[PDB]
């Protein structure tokens, strides 16, 4: 059909031709020459060469390059036949069927968001206004502020005050699909909740950078917007970052802390043989935090803190105990981050990287999935807080 091989116009006025149109023109011209020569009762020698040229023209139209030499026109390059549009990387399968270009998508440079949670990300307002056009149009037509769709389009293009309120209303519980360019496994496309920020960069959580394998030296990521209820439920239940905490290749976690968090938790949980406030009895972790923030006790000082740890060794219920531990000031401050089900022997040592990894493993093994996300978020928060004070 002619729409599958069109003749495009140019600015100069000359209509440029394609490869298939040239091959079809060659085949039709050779067939017309053969018919005109057969009408005039030619001898066999000329019509044998004419039938041979028609055979070569048909073979060049079907698959140019198999038999003989591929014909070149004005470019010293082989022409495209009907078989070149099906096979190869630029065929209809790998370029138009297996991988396509989709709507409701964007792309920007990623940055770091320390204040974000594990299930949310920072989305710019200039991208959220473009990716959520018909939702804002439907909400403006429902609220009655714009009866005509052209009035709603002009209200969005003018960027009025209620447009940002509608955009904040249609984004609160609508997830987006963030994706990096090399997708080696299934953790390269995760779902997050958009947070309207000011700027042109995407704020990414620091804990998902190990799963994404993306630092912040110029990396870019693509966003996608689900529209149907089934797609939103598949993003919330299957593709959410809080649901993918174990790798399906071997079972190891993918929410391991990076260098700044383990550096802060290593500097906080250490001790020296002589410091300010060494050798005093403390009544709890709140007095340790008060003595650290008041400037009367160092972060590395061997003290005696009365702790209250819980243990769930019974049939589901938790049993409490109270004793005097020989610990430091920073480990008591980190003990407020640790939940009730975990013991005290996992925090009384110097926290490296595998120690925090096995701490998160023990928390996910004993408590479950829901406190583990809050524990990892609070660990990242206190690591970023105590790496700056050092």
């Amino acid at each position: 059909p002619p729409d599958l091989r069109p003749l495009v116009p140019l600015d100069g006025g000359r209509f440029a031709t394609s490869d298939l149109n040239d091959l079809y023109r060659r085949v039709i011209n050779r067939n017309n020459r053969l018919k005109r020569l057969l009408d005039l009762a030619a001898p066999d020698i000329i019509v044998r060469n004419e039938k041979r040229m028609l055979q070569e023209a048909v073979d060049a139209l079907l698959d140019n390059g198999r038999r003989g030499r591929a014909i070149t026109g004005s470019n010293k390059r082989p022409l495209k036949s009907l078989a070149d549009m099906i096979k190869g990387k630029q065929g209809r399968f790998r370029q138009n069927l297996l991988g396509k270009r989709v709507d409701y998508s964007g792309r920007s440079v990623i940055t770091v968001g320390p204040y974000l949670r594990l299930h949310q990300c920072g989305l710019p307002k200039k991208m959220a206004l473009e990716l959520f056009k018909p939702f804002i149009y439907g909400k403006l037509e429902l609220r009655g502020l714009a009866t005509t769709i052209k009035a709603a389009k002009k209200m969005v293009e003018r960027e009025e005050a209620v447009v940002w309120d509608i955009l904040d209303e249609v984004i609160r519980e609508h997830p987006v699909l963030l994706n990096r360019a090399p997708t080696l496994h299934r953790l390269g496309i995760q779902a997050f909740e958009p947070v309207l920020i000011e700027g042109k960069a995407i704020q990414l959580h620091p804990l998902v950078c190990a799963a994404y394998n993306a630092d912040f030296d110029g990396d870019q990521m693509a966003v996608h917007v689900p529209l149907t209820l089934e797609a939103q439920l598949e993003a919330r239940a299957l593709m959410m970052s809080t649901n993918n905490i174990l790798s399906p290749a071997n079972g190891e976690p993918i929410i391991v802390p990076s260098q700044d968090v383990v550096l802060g938790l290593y500097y906080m949980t250490r001790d020296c043989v002589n410091a300010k406030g060494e050798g005093m009895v403390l009544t709890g972790p709140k007095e340790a935090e008060r003595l650290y923030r008041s400037g009367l006790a160092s972060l590395h000082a061997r003290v005696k803190v009365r702790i209250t740890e819980y243990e769930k060794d019974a049939n589901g219920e938790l049993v409490a105990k109270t004793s005097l531990k020989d610990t430091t000031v920073g480990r008591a401050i980190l003990w407020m981050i640790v939940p009730k089900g975990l013991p005290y022997s996992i925090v009384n040592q110097a926290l490296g990287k595998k120690a925090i990894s096995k701490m998160l493993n023990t928390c996910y093994r004993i408590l479950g999935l829901k406190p583990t996300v809050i524990f990892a978020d609070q660990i990242m928060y206190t690591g970023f807080a105590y790496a700056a004070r050092s």
Binding site: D103, E130, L131, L227, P248
Partner: protein, 1285 residues
């Protein structure tokens, strides 16, 4: 010290003295184009060789001949400044004088006239080419040198690990002749990688018999027959490596018994015995091979043929015939192998004609064989000058590999050349020989602009002489002139094809002078006749030991082409044949001399060269007993009285871009590679800022590039302005006739190739003495003649709340408020008004169906005003097309700016509008002022001469000279006005083209890519306020907070040394500023600056302030109040102890770490942090040019899919890996929505849009259109595929 360097002297660390100045960096392409473009006799390089290799032209026995006499280049109609603003090619007309003779012999009439054959583009003095207004750079090529090479299979084939050798002859132009082996030990030959043949076929094709073949490749063993006992000739060297199966007997003495091994003591006994005739039994003779044939003088029959085994019956037949001497062949297994014997046994051909038939059948498949056709084909392969040719370097490399004394010869091959190549291949196979490296720089040449231009001119000239011969065959003479035979179409076509659309002809990066000076000095292994970037291999990408001083190892792009795109070194040059060379100081036995010698790659391996940084006793001897040197691709410790040469400098190994990194030896090679790659991507800011920690090579980059205004003649500055600088030339450099002044027109705000702003700012004052070579205007990224690629700010290395998590950079708000990273980007919007049917197009301002609010910015001519802040969706050039329809030029959505310049180009027949008249009036006013300056200077001089003669024919003579000068100036003004109003050429069918330029200022923001000079890149995450940044006890906040976590992992310690040295330099600058702020005298300031310059141990700077005046010391102090620049060399850099002394010179601690207080809370940090100054750079990876978003838009025609790209408002591509990641989940509805509704289904996406607008989240799957296109395309191939139901 010149007048430019005396304004601000950079403190130069380093202990090694410089015995050789840094040469001109862009001299390679300039010297190549000078060798190509100049007039040179004796048939050497240039256009003369191309004209002599073609002319004279002979006809087919027509008694006619067209020969070449001389050529002459014309003058360009416009210079470089006008071809860029007009859009034409800066070329020159070629005028060649030919001569046509005719014989009956003798001649009867000679026709001589000048013939014009195309135009060739000239090279700018900076080293560029103007093709269509833009500047291009022809990249040099790195290809294999012509000659002969021997390689090894290294055991890949045959799966047994057997090593196979081969030999190939690569000419400069012609067919290939490759020789190969067999695991069955058979020598083969293949031409142009076709089906292989035995080498005896091409031997017999060169008129060789079997006896001559066995004579050339084997020795003769005389086997004579005596009366009895079967004597034979014995050579004692032939029995080495062979067992003794029989008893060796001679003259009754026993030497070696039966079954005894031959030891060298028995060989020495055979030497001492002096015997050559032993007894051999009959069973040993049958294992030999006969050499030639034997015929009977009485019978006359063929007993045995050549190259066959011996038997007892044929031995008896030679015994009865009376053949005394029998010639055999010597066959061994270590030194002489029977390869040619098995090659003759494999070859079924036994004639020259059959060999020619087989060669014709191999080269021409499917063709009827003919003896004359095979004779014409075999002669036109390696023995015809037209089809085959070897250069002088090819003949030199061919004769050097075969151990020949002569280096001269012909371009075609011969019989003895192929014989010597086969002999060398046989000796390599036997063991006496070795293969050579392909990666060696002595086997690789370097092409340039002139050689490729000469090759394209030769292709054009042979097409022209083909057309001339075909026109001379059909026609007569004595009625025409030699102008119609010469057609200037193929020469101009080949020249425009080479200069316009080529793999090595690319645009020059115009964002930095360093990017230009590294793109011009670029060596590429790709191109026509080179390698391929995806099929190169591991062995060609690594760095060779012969790359020392010739190819930089740390300057290559990372990605698809690593090691294929190399950069030239600083002191590296090019030989006469095309090989690389580096200078070496000649070291005699008495003293290390200073005379340099350019050694090539082959000459480097013979001598031994000491290290670059080897300390001496300042007289010329080595203070160490053993010094580290290199002899043949390896480093070792050598004696004192063993060296022959020495490195001339310590910067000869790195390139120009790699020598701008201070403390390079303290960084890893990967981080240095990343820093040298990212140093070329910087964007110039509003104001240039000098580096506090530099090297000293910045002035060479700023001067050798064409970005600054270098004064041609010294003198006194007469008139200073922001657009022009007038220089009054002194009488010492003035010409004796028509003395004048120099006028430098500064290049103001305009668009470069990378959509950036290039601008020249003046740096001189009124009445300032300048010298020859001093700069007058500072271009982009240039500060007082240095290279200022970025800004230097107060830096700190500490984590700040996770805002510098992986690579992120925390920038303060004072960096944004001072606008020190604001860049100017200029775009170009054109409006082509073409001539079509139904009347032409007009640029009238009366545009229908638009309000007057859009026409308020347009003038009466229809063009937008200069200086109007336009936005997205405004009419710039009002254009209508008669059917009237509207086709005016509008601003695209998303871009904006300010109109700064409008250029209007019109044809000769079309009447110009008011804007073109205003532009021509402004250009005529500028030319009138530029002529009137010299006019009033000469008028003042002539009136001074009138007053001199005054206090009567001399007055009349001077008045006649005054009227002659006025007439000459009027003629020059009329010529300039005619050159202005000469007109411009356009495309056929185009009336006029109007171009609008938009300028915008892009500030810094979170998302931009920042980097340094040590490979430490990052993206800004948050712009922090000034009250939240950490501060010291004095209250000075930090501008940039960096993360120290990347320092142990990525080993780049040079950034911390640069930080400490910049902190010391800023401390010295703040002490100078504190001394200058209070009222201080000149003596204390002078002695403080002298004490600051005298710091260092055994430095070679030696600045003495006794020769400086008080105004010069005050100007130097005002230039040093912002910081003292420090020159830290590449490997001769400053040590840590000198940084300690420089920190003790100020009020700063030696450790470089100070305590800081928090800005948010106010408490002191527990540990001191490293606070200093680091030269930062802003790359061309801004976030406003990368952010894109799309809900709905346009779709394609064939496959109903969204478009691709930001400029077309396209969408992102959901590739196959994202589909696999969605299939790895249970997300089936999301993949169905991505594949059908969001991409393909038109009815599905319209129903989905209507449902989302109405408020329903429900979709219909439908059928994708791409599957229907696939079904229609498979169905057109004659295959029936359909969906059944």
């Amino acid at each position: 010290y010149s007048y430019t360097e005396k304004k601000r002297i950079r403190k130069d660390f380093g202990k090694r003295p410089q015995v050789l100045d840094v040469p001109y960096l862009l001299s390679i392409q300039l010297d190549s184009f000078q060798k190509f473009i100049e007039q040179d006799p004796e048939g050497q390089y240039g256009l003369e060789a191309a004209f002599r290799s073609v002319f004279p032209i002979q006809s087919y026995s027509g008694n006619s001949e067209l020969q070449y006499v001389s050529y002459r280049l014309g003058e360009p109609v416009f210079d470089v400044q006008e071809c860029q603003i007009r859009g034409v090619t800066y070329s020159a007309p070629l005028r060649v004088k030919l001569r046509l003779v005719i014989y009956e012999g003798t001649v009867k009439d000679i026709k001589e006239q000048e013939v014009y054959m195309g135009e060739i583009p000239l090279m700018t003095d900076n080293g560029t080419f103007v093709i269509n207004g833009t500047e291009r750079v022809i990249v040099s090529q790195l290809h294999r040198s012509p000659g002969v090479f021997f390689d090894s299979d290294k055991g890949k084939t045959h799966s047994s690990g057997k090593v196979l050798y081969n030999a190939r002859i690569i000419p400069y132009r012609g067919s290939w002749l490759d020789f190969e082996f067999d695991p069955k030990d058979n020598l083969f030959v293949r031409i142009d990688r076709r089906r292989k043949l035995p080498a005896t076929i091409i031997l017999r094709a060169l008129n060789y018999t079997t006896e001559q073949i066995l004579d050339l490749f084997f020795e003769k063993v005389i086997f004579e027959i005596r009366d009895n006992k079967l004597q034979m000739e014995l050579v004692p060297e032939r029995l080495r490596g062979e067992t003794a199966s029989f008893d060796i007997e001679a003259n009754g003495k026993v030497y070696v018994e039966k079954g005894r091994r031959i030891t060298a003591r028995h060989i020495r006994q055979l030497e001492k015995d002096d015997v050559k005739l032993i007894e051999v039994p009959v069973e040993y003779i049958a294992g030999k091979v006969v050499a030639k044939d034997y015929i009977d003088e009485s019978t006359g029959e063929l007993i045995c043929a050549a190259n066959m085994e011996l038997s007892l019956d044929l031995l008896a037949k030679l015994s009865q015939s009376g053949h005394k001497r029998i010639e055999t062949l010597f066959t061994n297994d270590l030194d002489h192998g029977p390869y040619i014997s098995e090659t003759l046994r494999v070859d079924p051909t036994n004639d020259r004609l059959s060999a020619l038939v087989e060669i014709y059948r191999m080269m021409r498949p499917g063709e009827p064989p003919t003896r004359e056709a095979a004779e014409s084909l075999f002669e036109n392969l390696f023995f015809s000058e037209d089809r085959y040719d070897l250069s002088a370097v090819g003949r030199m490399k061919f004769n050097r590999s075969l151990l020949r004394e002569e280096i001269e010869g012909s371009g075609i091959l011969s019989k003895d050349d192929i014989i010597d190549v086969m002999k060398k291949l046989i000796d390599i196979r036997n063991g006496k020989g070795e293969v050579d490296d392909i990666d060696h720089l002595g086997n690789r040449r370097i092409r340039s602009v002139g050689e490729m231009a000469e090759n394209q001119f030769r292709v054009g000239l042979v097409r022209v002489e083909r057309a001339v011969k075909e026109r001379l065959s059909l026609g007569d003479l004595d009625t025409l002139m030699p102008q119609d035979m010469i057609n200037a179409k193929p020469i101009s076509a080949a020249v425009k094809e080479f200069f316009g659309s080529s793999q090595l002809s690319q645009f020059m990066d115009q964002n930095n002078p360093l990017s230009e000076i590294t793109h011009k000095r670029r060596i590429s292994a790709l191109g026509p006749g080179g390698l391929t970037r995806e099929r190169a291999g591991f062995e060609v990408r690594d760095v060779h030991p012969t790359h020392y001083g010739r190819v930089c190892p740390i300057e290559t792009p990372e990605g698809p082409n690593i090691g294929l795109i190399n950069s030239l070194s600083v002191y590296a040059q090019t030989n006469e044949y095309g090989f690389l060379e580096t200078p070496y100081r000649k070291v005699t036995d008495g003293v290390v001399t200073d005379e340099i010698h350019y050694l090539s790659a082959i000459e480097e391996g013979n001598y031994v060269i000491a290290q670059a940084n080897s300390n001496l006793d300042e007289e010329g001897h080595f203070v160490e007993d053993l010094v580290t040197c290199r002899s043949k691709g390896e480093s070792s410790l050598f004696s004192r009285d063993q060296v022959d040469y020495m490195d001339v400098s310590t910067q000869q190994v790195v390139s120009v871009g790699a020598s701008l990194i201070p403390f390079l030896e303290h960084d890893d090679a990967n981080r240095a590679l990343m820093g040298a790659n990212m140093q070329r991507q910087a964007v110039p800011t509003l104001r240039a800022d000098k580096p506090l920690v530099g090297t000293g090579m910045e002035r060479a980059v700023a001067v050798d590039s064409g970005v600054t205004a270098v004064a041609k003649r010294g003198g006194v500055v007469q008139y200073v302005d922001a657009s022009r600088i007038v220089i009054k030339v002194n009488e010492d450099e003035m010409y004796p006739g028509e003395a004048g002044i120099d006028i430098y027109n500064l290049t103001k705000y305009t668009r470069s190739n990378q959509n950036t702003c290039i601008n020249q700012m003046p740096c001189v004052s009124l009445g300032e003495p300048v010298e020859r070579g001093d700069v007058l205007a500072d271009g982009p990224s240039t500060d007082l003649g240095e290279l200022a690629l970025g800004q230097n700010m107060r830096v700190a290395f500490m984590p700040w709340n996770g805002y510098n998590f992986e690579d992120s950079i925390l920038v303060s708000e004072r960096v944004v408020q001072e606008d020190r990273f604001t860049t100017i980007h200029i775009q170009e919007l054109a409006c082509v008004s073409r001539d079509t049917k139904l009347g032409p197009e007009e640029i009238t301002a009366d545009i229908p169906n638009v309000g007057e609010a859009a026409l308020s910015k347009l003038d009466e001519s229809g063009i937008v005003y200069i200086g109007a802040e336009v936005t997205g969706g405004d009419i710039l050039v009002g254009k209508v097309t008669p059917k009237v329809k509207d086709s005016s030029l509008r601003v695209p959505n998303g871009v904006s700016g300010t109109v700064i310049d409008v250029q209007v180009f019109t044809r000769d027949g079309v009447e110009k509008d008011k804007r073109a008249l205003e532009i021509e009036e402004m250009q005529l006013k500028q030319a009138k002022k530029d002529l009137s300056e010299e006019l009033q200077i000469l008028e003042a001089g002539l009136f001074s001469r009138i007053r001199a003669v005054l206090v009567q024919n001399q007055l009349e003579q001077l008045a006649e000279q005054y009227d002659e000068l006025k007439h000459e100036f009027e003629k020059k003004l009329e010529a300039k006005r005619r050159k202005i109003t000469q007109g411009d050429d356009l495309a056929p069918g185009v009336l006029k083209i109007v171009k609008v330029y938009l300028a915008v200022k892009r500030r810094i923001q979170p998302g931009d890519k920042m980097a340094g000079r040590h490979g430490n890149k990052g993206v800004i995450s948050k712009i922090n306020p000034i009250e939240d940044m950490p501060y010291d006890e004095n209250g000075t906040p930090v501008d940039i907070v960096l993360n120290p976590l990347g320092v142990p992992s990525r080993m780049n310690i040079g950034q911390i040394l640069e930080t400490h040295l910049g902190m010391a330099a800023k401390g010295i600058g703040d002490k100078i500023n504190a001394m200058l702020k209070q009222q201080q005298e000149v003596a204390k300031l002078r002695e403080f600056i002298q004490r600051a310059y005298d710091l260092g141990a055994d430095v070679r700077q030696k600045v003495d302030l006794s020769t400086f005046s008080d105004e010069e010391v005050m100007r130097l102090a005002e230039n040093l109040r912002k910081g003292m620049p420090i020159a830290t060399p590449v490997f001769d850099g400053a040590k840590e102890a000198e940084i300690k002394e420089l920190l003790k010179l100020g009020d700063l601690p030696t450790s470089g770490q100070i305590r800081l207080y928090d800005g948010r809370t106010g408490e002191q940090f527990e540990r001191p942090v490293t606070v200093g100054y680091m030269y930062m750079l802003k790359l061309n990876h801004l976030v406003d040019d990368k952010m894109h978003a799309r809900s709905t838009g346009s779709y394609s025609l064939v496959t109903q899919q969204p478009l691709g790209g930001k400029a077309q408002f396209g969408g992102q591509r959901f590739g196959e890996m994202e589909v696999w990641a969605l299939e790895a989940y249970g997300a089936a509805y999301t993949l169905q929505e991505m594949l059908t509704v969001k991409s393909d289904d038109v009815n599905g996406r319209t129903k989905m849009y209507k449902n989302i607008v109405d408020g329903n989240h429900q979709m219909e799957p439908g059928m994708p259109e791409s599957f229907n296109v696939l079904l229609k395309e498979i169905r057109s191939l004659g295959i029936n595929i359909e969906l059944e139901d």
